Amino acid sequence: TTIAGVVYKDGIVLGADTRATEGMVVADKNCSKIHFISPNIYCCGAGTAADTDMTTQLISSNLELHSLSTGRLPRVVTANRMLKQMLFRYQGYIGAALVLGGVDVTGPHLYSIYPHGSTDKLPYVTMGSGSLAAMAVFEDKFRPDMEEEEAKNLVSEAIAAGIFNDLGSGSNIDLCVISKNKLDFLRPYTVPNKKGTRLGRYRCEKGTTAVLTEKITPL
């Protein structure tokens, strides 16, 4: 998998692919890996799928309760705190690696969280199996205070390099743009690959299959 995030002059851009495999066989071709946490906070997960799903759902509910009680928009530091404390409590048996990002009354914030409870605050981050192929692109072409479109192009290039150079990544590209005044959730953003057209006609005509028993249950 390949998940990436960048900070530009007004907000955050996050991106991910959509392939999910089981062993060496492609299971899902349209997986979703960008998770809602708060109207201003989002997360991209990698590792074991079930663990990331349950972790994000639990943290989202806790932040919902906290925001209802206080009456204010939540902060990225709060979500980072709860995530890292819960992950450290389990001593690394929850194989979730997370890229967390959001905009609050302090400005854009972007964190990376590891399965053992570590945390980094950085201006651009990548995770997954194809994390090195995208980090190459970020090291080559990153500048501070980019515009929206330049950051979107940069994230697309990083994710495309991860898709094309790694066997565990593929299919489409998803983008999420978080800004102070809006939130864009592009699904999908690019479709680099398409399925070839079938040449033959293998339609099975009626009466090809032999049947032993049959019963009809009228509802």
């Binding site: 066989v25 349209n30 079930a50 349950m54 005509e205 090809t208 299959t209 028993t213 009809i216 249950t217």
Partner: protein
């Protein structure tokens, strides 16, 4: 492996205003047959079914606990369950036993009781939902079924062509698996009727 101790194969496919779910019929212990008419597809409503493949004890245990919970839910609420809600319920039930998991992988197929819009999905060992639009497979012969379904499935299938497609896919897939087969059972779920059929397959 533990998933291959008993064997088994189940699949679900989506048509136009209808769904189809199929499973094999064999209970054995490794390389020895014990019985033929083993049940792996259970009804969870008027137009909703779930199929379990994997280890037989876990198949039966999961089916019974799920029926327990579903009955209590329907008594409290006063309505029928929805396919999304059933998928979430099964994911919760499977994740509760993390680090001690049940060795099954369910497949859910049904129609929306309000709009009759098809729904098929599959969950993994520890409960990660994975909703598709074309077809889902589960069991020891997943590669064969993927190969057959990628080539035979086409959008907007009426009940007859859907039945023929799923029959051919299941038959040709389980003909290449040693510990699966010896009969195929097919359910066609439609708006106003349900059709159950048993296919003629090799018994060796």
């Amino acid at each position: 492996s533990i998933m291959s101790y008993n064997g088994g194969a189940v699949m679900a496919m989506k048509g136009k205003n209808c769904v189809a779910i199929a499973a094999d019929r064999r209970f054995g212990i490794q390389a020895q047959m014990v019985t033929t008419d083993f049940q792996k597809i259970f009804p969870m409503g008027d137009r909703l079914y779930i199929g379990l493949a994997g280890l037989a004890t876990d198949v039966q245990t999961v089916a019974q606990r799920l029926k327990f919970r579903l009955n209590l839910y329907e008594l409290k609420e006063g309505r029928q369950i929805k396919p999304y809600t059933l998928m979430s319920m099964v994911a919760n039930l499977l994740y509760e036993k993390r680090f001690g998991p049940y060795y099954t992988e369910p497949v859910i197929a049904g129609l929306d009781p309000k709009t009759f819009k098809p729904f098929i999905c599959s969950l993994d060992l520890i409960g990660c939902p994975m909703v598709t639009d074309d077809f889902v497979v589960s069991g020891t012969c997943a590669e064969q079924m993927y190969g057959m379904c990628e080539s035979l499935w086409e959008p907007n299938m009426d009940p007859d062509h859907l039945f023929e497609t799923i029959s051919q896919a299941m038959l040709n897939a389980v003909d290449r698996d040693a510990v699966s087969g010896m009969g195929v059972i097919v359910h066609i779920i439609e708006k106003d009727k349900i059709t159950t059929r048993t296919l003629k397959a090799r018994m060796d």
